[PDB]
Amino acid sequence: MLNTCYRILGLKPTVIFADQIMYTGFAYAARSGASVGIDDMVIPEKKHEII
Amino acid sequence: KPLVGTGMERAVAVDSGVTAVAKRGGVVQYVDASRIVIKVNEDEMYPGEAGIDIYNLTKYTRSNQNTCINQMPCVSLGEPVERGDVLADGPSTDLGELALGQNMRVAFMPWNGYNFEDSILVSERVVQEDRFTTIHIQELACVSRDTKLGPEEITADIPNVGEAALSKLDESGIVYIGAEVTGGDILVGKVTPKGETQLTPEEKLLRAIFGEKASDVKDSSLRVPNGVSGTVIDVQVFTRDGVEKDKRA
Amino acid sequence: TEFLKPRLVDIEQVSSTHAKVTLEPLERGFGHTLGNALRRILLSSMPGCAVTEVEIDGVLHEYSTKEGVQEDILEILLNLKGLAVRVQGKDEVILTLNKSGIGPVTAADITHDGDVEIVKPQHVICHLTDENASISMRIKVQRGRGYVPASTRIHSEEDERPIGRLLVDACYSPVERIAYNVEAARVEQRTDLDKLVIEMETNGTIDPEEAIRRAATILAEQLEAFVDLR
Amino acid sequence: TEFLKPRLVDIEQVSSTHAKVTLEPLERGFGHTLGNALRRILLSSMPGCAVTEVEIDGVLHEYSTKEGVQEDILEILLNLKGLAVRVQGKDEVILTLNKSGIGPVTAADITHDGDVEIVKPQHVICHLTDENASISMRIKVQRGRGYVPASTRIHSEEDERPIGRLLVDACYSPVERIAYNVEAARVEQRTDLDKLVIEMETNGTIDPEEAIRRAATILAEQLEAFVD
Amino acid sequence: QDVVLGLYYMTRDCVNAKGEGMVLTGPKEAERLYRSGLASLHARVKVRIT
Amino acid sequence: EIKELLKLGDLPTSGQIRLYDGRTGEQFERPVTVGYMYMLKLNHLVDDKM
């Protein structure tokens, strides 16, 4: 996206774009609620069957 | 105390020799912030001596890393204590168990990038409880030397000074116990001998305009380092065996 | 405008510290608009009386020790931060406390001022072990708001610097926990409406209902800038 | 109380649709307290006029086709949702629209009512390809607030609902985008203060500055129950 | 890190969810409906963008 | 054992709680792990660095 933006529009547009991408990225990443529960680390059904 | 420990907590705190554990079991005859007095039971107590152990707890003083060292009593007045029990807790110990840091309600989620690369977002409520507020114990020293020109001494008489600087000092030239200090304020007044001094024309005129003719002695008073600010908790004076003393000494 | 104003319906005061305040009818979206906007003010802006300065004889700093006392001086200061106090007329009162002998020093040992209420007279302030031991101090209680630490107060006015006055963090704000619940109010036709239940959990003194009225009035004081100036 | 009230400083109206409103001085923490509390009201509670019901002849449902027309009927309904309309006296008006021949049907082809303003007469509503083709319809514009779509309307009004009545999601709310920026206001001593920049974007039926005063006035009217 | 994750969350789609197959004037009405609580960031929608 | 202890505390089996943004008041889009982590204050303090 940034390379495209650069080769097309130029420098100014990219710096802005790059920042805005970063800002919305962080913001919406935080809105997601993204966490690290231990039920998030799902072991497959049949591990004890394979080993 | 740590809510999420291993059990090794007490073992560390006790064996470190930073806490004060009971040599003999019995009832604490007297509790105090400075010391602990415990009465020994008949079975343990020796028949020869009286049988009352003394434990003068190490109170707030310095560390090798310039931090606090305290021993608070973890026992109540007149409490029955068993042999080998923690009587006073150390600087990082709680009911004998190790207490290095503090536990708190944490939540894993990003926050407008204020936790970007492992960056931490802490509540003001943590700062309000002053719970992560650590104590630093610095030790600034002041040396009276014997130069080729003559001996140095330690008096309140310092040339080129504000009454504001000599306010926290006494007559001897040492800051009071409990006096708050800040970078630029002088802890201990010192003066060294000043030799053949070429008073530059612009200084001979300036010392002849306002006056205040300085004496034959240089200035080198120990002043709080530019930036540091705390409370003086104690001051200790070491002297050779000779020259008469300051009144504060 | 289809202005639909709410009305203070029920106040279940389960305890003088913790009390619920249900609110309806609220038009949709305003449940949270008010809910949080209020919460923010109710935590930060709410005013009360707290200990600012203390002064003990035979004491020069908060780090030192006093014989015949279990707690150190800092541990005493902390007990005086959360000392529940009300000051009726003035904004600055200096109460005196003398006590001795073997007794757990409570807030009832303080000589209460003509226009000063100590809410919790059983509140522990210090423990005396030796009977020979005697404590004497002067507690300055000022009125403010939010949280004013000693580090924010040791870089401002500071006229008289008397060696002996120990500054202690004064937790002026009385609200300790606040949280608002937004449930659904069902009207014959309006079933999308919501009710606002504010669960407030404060220290002594500042009454739950009185605090809500103080926070709403301060928000309306800030809004006179938007009614008048465009 | 150290009450520190703000004052409406600058209003840079870059366009009649989009206008910035800088605000200071605000005491710390209130920048967001107001910022969002306002945003929420300004999106949901602000009232406006929007198309509710439409009625086209030779048409029985919104899924069908009409010859001589590029757009489908749903595509037309969507153009009428975002049709900018003002109704001066009444709260319910039924405008009529007749047009024919090869011409991009605009909002100027609508027969405007004595007390009805079509803000954008160039607004596209339908495209006519055949010259023989002729379109005729009856647009009902009601006044409401927020967003009331057919899904949210069929969950609440389950009274009269006959076939043929194309329910278009009427965008009553005139604020389209609102977002507030919290910058730092520096006073000689107070350097922790903040300023509130609200970048709003309405349609034109309500003035940006006027809309902020409506959302602050409704908030003060809900505080009449709390004595002071 | 977060920036990339936050964008992936946004763009990535899901089945129906709240307000499937709705129809919007612009990308501003999409922010309007999501933050209004009447659409998920993962809803298939026929929007008109220029 | 941990999930059994959480049932005694009438806490969620998950360990993720329904969180609300303080700035705003509206809920976050989906649950977040909350609990008590014993953290430490390292000697590397900024007053001793800058």
Side-chain angles (χ1 to χ4, degrees):
Chain A
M1 289 183 83
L2 290 165
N3 196 26
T4 302
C5 173
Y6 174 72
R7 308 259 73 201
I8 294 177
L9 301 164
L11 172 53
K12 293 209 179 184
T14 50
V15 177
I16 274 206
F17 192 32
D19 291 354
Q20 307 274 207
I21 291 163
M22 181 184 73
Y23 294 133
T24 42
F26 287 136
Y28 273 101
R31 284 198 51 85
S32 58
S35 196
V36 183
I38 222 168
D39 284 36
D40 297 358
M41 332 199 78
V42 312
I43 308 164
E45 305 147 38
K46 59 248 153 192
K47 198 208 70 146
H48 296 275
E49 195 165 337
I50 287 168
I51 295 170
Chain B
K1 73 209 164 176
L3 290 172
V4 263
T6 63
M8 284 288 293
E9 266 62 26
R10 184 195 285 268
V12 166
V14 166
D15 293 352
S16 54
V18 81
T19 54
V21 304
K23 297 163 181 162
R24 294 189 286 182
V27 176
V28 185
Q29 183 169 32
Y30 174 60
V31 164
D32 183 19
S34 63
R35 57 168 191 177
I36 294 175
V37 178
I38 192 154
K39 214 161 183 190
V40 183
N41 296 333
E42 172 61 25
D43 54 344
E44 289 176 5
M45 187 166 38
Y46 273 82
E49 59 172 3
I52 307 195
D53 296 359
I54 174 171
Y55 307 91
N56 284 41
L57 302 180
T58 63
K59 282 280 96 174
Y60 297 86
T61 330
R62 188 171 67 85
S63 70
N64 290 344
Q65 280 66 29
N66 307 340
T67 68
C68 150
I69 300 195
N70 190 42
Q71 279 184 7
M72 267 171 47
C74 68
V75 289
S76 61
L77 177 59
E79 181 171 33
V81 168
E82 203 70 19
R83 183 184 168 177
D85 287 14
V86 184
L87 294 171
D89 288 348
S92 215
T93 76
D94 182 0
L95 279 156
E97 282 171 12
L98 191 65
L100 302 176
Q102 287 174 335
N103 40 68
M104 35 203 67
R105 188 185 268 257
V106 182
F108 297 96
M109 43 160 289
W111 179 267
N112 305 60
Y114 282 99
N115 49 359
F116 179 64
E117 277 214 20
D118 300 17
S119 291
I120 298 175
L121 184 65
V122 48
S123 174
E124 187 181 350
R125 209 158 194 75
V126 155
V127 192
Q128 282 201 356
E129 293 164 0
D130 311 313
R131 58 184 323 169
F132 258 131
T133 306
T134 59
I135 319 140
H136 307 279
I137 318 193
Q138 200 169 344
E139 200 192 16
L140 302 200
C142 187
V143 64
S144 71
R145 299 195 178 283
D146 188 25
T147 60
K148 139 190 153 51
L149 289 189
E152 312 181 357
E153 247 203 14
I154 310 186
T155 316
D157 170 31
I158 311 166
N160 303 43
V161 180
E163 205 74 309
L166 310 168
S167 62
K168 292 160 179 167
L169 296 174
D170 69 335
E171 186 191 11
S172 307
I174 304 169
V175 150
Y176 291 106
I177 320 185
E180 257 222 326
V181 295
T182 308
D185 303 345
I186 292 174
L187 291 167
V188 172
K190 175 174 71 161
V191 292
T192 93
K194 186 211 193 75
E196 185 272 327
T197 294
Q198 305 182 356
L199 266 199
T200 182
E202 293 80 3
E203 279 182 5
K204 176 192 169 188
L205 181 53
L206 283 174
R207 281 202 168 167
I209 293 183
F210 266 95
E212 297 100 25
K213 283 192 255 182
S215 32
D216 269 22
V217 124
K218 221 268 156 61
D219 185 23
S220 194
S221 303
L222 159 76
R223 33 192 159 271
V224 173
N226 201 1
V228 159
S229 64
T231 306
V232 176
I233 56 171
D234 189 22
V235 177
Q236 195 64 32
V237 182
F238 306 90
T239 310
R240 267 186 68 195
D241 190 5
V243 164
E244 209 161 12
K245 333 190 171 191
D246 309 333
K247 184 203 178 185
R248 176 65 182 281
Chain C
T1 312
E2 300 300 344
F3 41 85
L4 203 185
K5 305 149 285 193
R7 349 171 187 189
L8 182 28
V9 169
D10 181 25
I11 292 170
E12 185 185 2
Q13 185 155 323
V14 178
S15 178
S16 53
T17 187
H18 180 84
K20 294 183 185 180
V21 176
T22 73
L23 222 308
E24 49 190 340
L26 298 159
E27 268 175 347
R28 83 151 221 86
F30 300 128
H32 279 263
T33 302
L34 291 172
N36 185 58
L38 274 175
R39 193 177 66 88
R40 301 182 53 96
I41 302 170
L42 272 158
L43 281 169
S44 61
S45 325
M46 274 312 294
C49 306
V51 179
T52 300
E53 295 179 15
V54 177
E55 192 170 7
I56 312 188
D57 50 31
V59 168
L60 292 170
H61 44 90
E62 56 191 330
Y63 305 101
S64 42
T65 175
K66 194 151 189 184
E67 193 277 335
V69 186
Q70 268 174 344
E71 301 81 355
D72 294 7
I73 296 168
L74 275 154
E75 183 162 16
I76 288 172
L77 295 174
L78 262 295
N79 296 347
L80 292 174
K81 294 197 187 170
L83 184 61
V85 176
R86 157 189 270 160
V87 181
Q88 297 172 14
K90 311 166 190 168
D91 288 358
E92 170 180 10
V93 300
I94 301 172
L95 318 170
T96 64
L97 164 59
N98 299 349
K99 192 71 177 44
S100 315
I102 316 164
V105 173
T106 55
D109 299 349
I110 301 173
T111 58
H112 95 274
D113 192 18
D115 60 339
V116 164
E117 188 196 25
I118 302 167
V119 176
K120 192 171 194 173
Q122 68 187 340
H123 175 80
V124 179
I125 286 162
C126 168
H127 277 88
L128 297 171
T129 52
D130 189 14
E131 82 186 20
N132 192 29
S134 61
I135 190 174
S136 169
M137 64 182 77
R138 288 191 295 275
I139 310 169
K140 172 176 286 182
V141 179
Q142 311 189 33
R143 178 181 299 161
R145 70 163 204 276
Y147 185 83
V148 181
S151 53
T152 265
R153 212 207 291 281
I154 188 222
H155 219 90
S156 36
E157 339 146 313
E158 261 203 345
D159 19 17
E160 46 138 64
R161 43 160 223 299
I163 305 163
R165 252 188 179 77
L166 314 167
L167 213 54
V168 186
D169 303 8
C171 311
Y172 299 120
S173 175
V175 182
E176 199 80 326
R177 175 176 85 79
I178 168 169
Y180 65 92
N181 320 327
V182 183
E183 292 86 342
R186 204 186 77 84
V187 185
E188 276 66 22
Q189 297 204 346
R190 315 292 310 282
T191 58
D192 185 22
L193 297 187
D194 40 345
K195 67 181 78 176
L196 188 62
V197 176
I198 301 189
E199 296 194 358
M200 186 169 293
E201 192 171 38
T202 175
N203 56 352
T205 292
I206 293 293
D207 195 55
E209 186 184 334
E210 180 156 2
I212 288 157
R213 189 177 308 157
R214 285 181 179 193
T217 305
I218 283 169
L219 172 50
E221 205 156 23
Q222 294 279 328
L223 286 169
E224 277 193 340
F226 306 109
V227 174
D228 301 1
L229 207 52
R230 314 295 204 81
Chain D
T1 312
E2 300 300 344
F3 42 84
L4 203 185
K5 302 160 281 179
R7 349 172 188 189
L8 183 25
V9 168
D10 175 35
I11 293 173
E12 185 185 1
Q13 186 159 326
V14 178
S15 178
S16 51
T17 187
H18 181 84
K20 297 180 178 182
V21 177
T22 72
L23 221 309
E24 49 190 342
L26 297 160
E27 265 175 349
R28 80 151 220 86
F30 302 126
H32 279 262
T33 303
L34 286 169
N36 185 57
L38 271 172
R39 194 176 64 86
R40 301 183 54 96
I41 303 171
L42 272 159
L43 281 170
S44 62
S45 325
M46 282 309 295
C49 300
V51 181
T52 300
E53 298 181 8
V54 178
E55 186 169 11
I56 311 185
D57 50 31
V59 168
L60 294 167
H61 44 90
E62 54 193 334
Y63 305 101
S64 41
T65 175
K66 196 157 182 180
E67 192 276 335
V69 186
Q70 271 173 357
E71 296 84 351
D72 297 9
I73 296 169
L74 276 154
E75 186 159 17
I76 287 173
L77 295 172
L78 261 294
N79 296 348
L80 292 174
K81 293 194 184 172
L83 183 61
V85 174
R86 155 190 269 158
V87 181
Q88 297 175 4
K90 311 165 192 168
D91 285 10
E92 180 165 0
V93 299
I94 301 172
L95 317 170
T96 65
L97 163 59
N98 299 349
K99 192 70 175 51
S100 315
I102 316 165
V105 174
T106 54
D109 300 349
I110 301 175
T111 60
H112 97 274
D113 190 18
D115 59 340
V116 164
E117 187 194 26
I118 302 167
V119 178
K120 192 171 191 182
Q122 69 169 345
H123 176 80
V124 178
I125 286 163
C126 168
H127 277 90
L128 295 172
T129 53
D130 190 14
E131 82 181 16
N132 193 28
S134 60
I135 191 176
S136 168
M137 64 183 77
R138 287 194 294 275
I139 308 170
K140 173 177 282 181
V141 178
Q142 306 191 32
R143 180 179 297 166
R145 68 170 193 270
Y147 184 48
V148 195
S151 57
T152 302
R153 208 185 292 280
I154 194 216
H155 148 107
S156 67
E157 170 233 352
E158 75 153 337
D159 204 331
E160 100 158 343
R161 269 169 65 260
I163 311 164
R165 227 191 198 77
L166 297 176
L167 205 49
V168 198
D169 317 18
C171 305
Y172 293 127
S173 180
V175 183
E176 194 61 7
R177 176 174 86 82
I178 168 169
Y180 65 92
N181 319 327
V182 181
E183 292 86 343
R186 205 195 77 85
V187 186
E188 275 74 5
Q189 297 186 3
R190 314 292 309 283
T191 58
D192 181 25
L193 298 185
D194 42 343
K195 67 181 78 177
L196 187 63
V197 176
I198 299 188
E199 294 194 359
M200 199 191 275
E201 190 166 4
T202 182
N203 50 0
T205 60
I206 300 210
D207 200 52
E209 169 214 326
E210 180 141 344
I212 295 155
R213 182 185 313 157
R214 284 181 182 201
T217 297
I218 282 165
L219 197 43
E221 272 186 7
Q222 304 280 96
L223 289 162
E224 299 186 338
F226 304 106
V227 200
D228 331 323
Chain E
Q1 231 140 272
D2 327 61
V3 209
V4 206
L5 155 47
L7 294 159
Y8 173 85
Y9 194 80
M10 286 168 85
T11 54
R12 164 151 184 199
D13 63 330
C14 177
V15 172
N16 43 37
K18 260 218 169 181
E20 182 195 29
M22 302 212 70
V23 266
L24 317 176
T25 60
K28 303 182 296 164
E29 179 185 354
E31 177 158 16
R32 197 156 78 86
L33 283 172
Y34 159 65
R35 216 147 201 180
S36 297
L38 296 157
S40 178
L41 303 165
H42 329 283
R44 313 144 186 265
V45 169
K46 245 137 134 202
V47 207
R48 155 204 215 78
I49 307 292
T50 298
Chain F
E1 297 195 320
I2 287 157
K3 286 187 180 194
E4 190 71 12
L5 196 71
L6 282 166
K7 296 177 188 175
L8 183 55
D10 300 7
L11 306 179
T13 306
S14 324
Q16 292 187 354
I17 303 176
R18 279 183 63 175
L19 287 207
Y20 294 88
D21 176 1
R23 287 167 300 164
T24 62
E26 58 206 4
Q27 204 190 174
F28 294 106
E29 272 297 67
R30 76 192 220 272
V32 157
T33 292
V34 176
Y36 293 66
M37 179 200 288
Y38 193 71
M39 301 201 70
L40 305 168
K41 192 164 162 194
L42 306 173
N43 191 30
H44 300 302
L45 295 166
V46 65
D47 304 36
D48 293 45
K49 290 284 176 199
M50 171 159 77

